[PDB]
């Protein structure tokens, strides 16, 4: 049901009050999730944007953290594309992009056909006999081989808690990646260097101090200094 609120005192949309959702806070002022399986499609869009954002951010911080500690010489994420391509063991960019596009289209084709008809991928004799566990128990939550440790076959009150923990860490990594592109756009440095700069020197290292994010604010500082 309803847990928390994105804005206390705001008028909750009617489609979000009695709705059983993972991480629902009433945050839909534009009423995009008014229709029911339209919200199901955007639930899957939010889940699949967050899951690749989780892997993307973890692929940025954990190599970035280990770079600060000096264990690995892994470069920064923004220049990692040119680092691998210019290397002597480089698969060409056209081959990599075609392989990524072909592999994801096959995967997202199964994900798409699961959405239109739930449990339709469990038809016998299609994926060499192992498609019997490929039936999605919930929209955006397929299960089966995707949960081989049995961490979802638990009490129902623990399941939505795990779903709430998934969407909360999913949204947090999702705004983190926007911060990562914005901080590379403004400062031109990695998130680890930016975090160390803010920790060691918080006042002089701010997005307001940088003129890229807020144009003309540095001229206000220069005019006030003179």
């Amino acid at each position: 049901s309803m847990q928390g609120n994105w804005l206390p005192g705001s008028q909750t949309p009617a489609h979000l009050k009695d709705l059983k959702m993972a991480g629902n806070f009433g945050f839909d002022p534009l009423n995009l999730g008014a229709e029911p399986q339209a919200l199901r499609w955007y639930q899957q869009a939010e889940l699949v944007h967050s899951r690749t954002a989780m892997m993307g951010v973890a692929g940025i911080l954990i190599p970035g953290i280990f770079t600060k500690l000096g264990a690995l010489n892994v470069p920064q994420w923004y220049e990692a594309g040119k680092v691998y391509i210019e290397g002597e063991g480089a698969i060409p960019f056209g081959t990599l992009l075609m392989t990524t596009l072909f592999s994801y289209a096959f995967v997202e084709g199964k994900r798409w056909q699961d959405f239109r008809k739930p449990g339709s991928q469990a038809e016998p004799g299609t994926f060499f006999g192992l498609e019997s566990q490929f039936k999605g128990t919930e929209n955006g939550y397929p299960g089966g081989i995707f949960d081989p440790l049995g961490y979802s076959k638990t009490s129902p009150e623990k399941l939505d808690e795990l779903k709430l923990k998934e969407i909360k860490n999913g949204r947090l990594a999702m705004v983190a990646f926007l911060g990562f592109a914005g901080q590379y756009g403004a400062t031109g440095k990695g998130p680890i260097d930016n975090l160390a700069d803010h920790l060691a020197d918080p006042w002089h290292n701010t997005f307001a101090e940088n003129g890229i994010s807020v144009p003309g604010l540095s001229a206000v500082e220069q005019a006030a200094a003179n």
């Binding site: 002022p29 534009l30 009423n31 995009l32 229709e35 339209a38």
Partner: peptide
């Protein structure tokens, strides 16, 4: 006016139905 940022998302869903 302030609830029209997601205009193509509202336009697509109304087109199908």
């Amino acid at each position: 006016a302030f609830q029209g940022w997601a205009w193509p998302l509202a336009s697509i869903q109304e087109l199908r139905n």
